[PDB]
Symmetry: C4
Subunit: 94 residues, 4 copies
């Protein structure tokens, strides 16, 4: 078990929870839409919508700067600790 991976996972879940609550409260999005906006923002995919309120713009700025680094670290650890071992195991002739 990788502690760095566990922390990055919990931090990402809390980050996405925080984003969902914020955008559904301040920007008036449905929780599902708020979660989607948080995910596509922190993975840098982006969305067709932007925050309308100045508070949403400021939060999104800070959210982006801390969130991108965490999610990116989680995606890296997810690739090397889970997806890559699973791919390798699944390529073994049995």
């Amino acid at each position: 078990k990788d502690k760095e991976f566990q922390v990055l996972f919990v931090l990402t879940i809390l980050t996405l929870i925080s984003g969902t609550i914020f955008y559904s409260t301040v920007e008036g999005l449905r929780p599902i839409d708020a979660l989607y906006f948080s995910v596509v923002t922190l993975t840098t995919v982006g969305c067709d919508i932007s925050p309308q309120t100045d508070f949403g713009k400021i939060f999104t700025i800070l959210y982006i700067f801390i969130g991108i680094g965490l999610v990116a670290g989680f995606i890296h650890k997810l690739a090397v600790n889970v997806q890559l071992p699973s791919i390798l195991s699944n390529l073994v002739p049995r």
Copy 2:
């Protein structure tokens, strides 16, 4: 190089999976479904988004499932594409 070959195959299958899902669930044309799948997993982004809740949840999982895969494929593809030029001018 079997490393690049497997990354290609995985990327193809992932993109196929997205094209099928978005063309059937989100009603996009196949070419538009593929485009959405590609720009989503490469993080270029689109000027549309899934309008169904089912499509939103899928795109979230689709991103985490495929974003790292496509990143690895783009890297290996870059190496193979530029290596002839590096070797020629060297």
Copy 3:
């Protein structure tokens, strides 16, 4: 850590430079100019684009000038932000 400090400063100045340019040349409000600068250099992207040719050329140069800087800053910021949690649960 002076490494993180200099990356912070450089990022601040780059973002300030974009906010000034986009608020004056592209007529955005300062907060919107900053938002555009941030989402452009982090590659999140925006639902607008510069409408003047001068703004387009600037954003092209602005991307190549700052994209690598912000990437390095986001990495160092990530390390500093998560390191207390790593150490606490270890």
Copy 4:
């Protein structure tokens, strides 16, 4: 002088030239807008516009897959061979 950096530079310039010509021809954009769309696409920033024609969609797909890797490699080499040495030199007390 770094040959890898030189090749990555020339390849990026040719890639952006190719994109500009394509999008101004097939998608009917002004050359400046075509170049902008090529840059923001290959850096993954994205644009508010998407290709309208099916040929533009297919080209953009292939363009993205080859273009992102090259531009990303150029940006890396630009950071380590040019921007970072320049920053370090500019931080030297004189």
